[PDB]
Amino acid sequence: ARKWFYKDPQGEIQGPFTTQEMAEWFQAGYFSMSLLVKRGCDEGFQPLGEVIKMWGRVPFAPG
């Protein structure tokens, strides 16, 4: 399922991406803790560090 979005430094929304695509980019080091991310169904973009705090784990991993 394609459901992940992020905002690039120029404010443009990118997506939708699969969880596996996000996991790949996260493990490769492309995503900082300040990157604004959300699922389509979510209310608002949040920094990835805060998403991890909210979810209790990195959201792209198995749970």
């Binding site: 992020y6 690039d8 430094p9 120029q10 443009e12 990118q14 980019w25 492309y30 995503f31 990157l35």
Partner: peptide, 8 residues
């Protein structure tokens, strides 16, 4: 492929 928009 790098993530669009993040690496120019």
């Amino acid at each position: 492929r790098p993530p669009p928009g993040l690496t120019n």
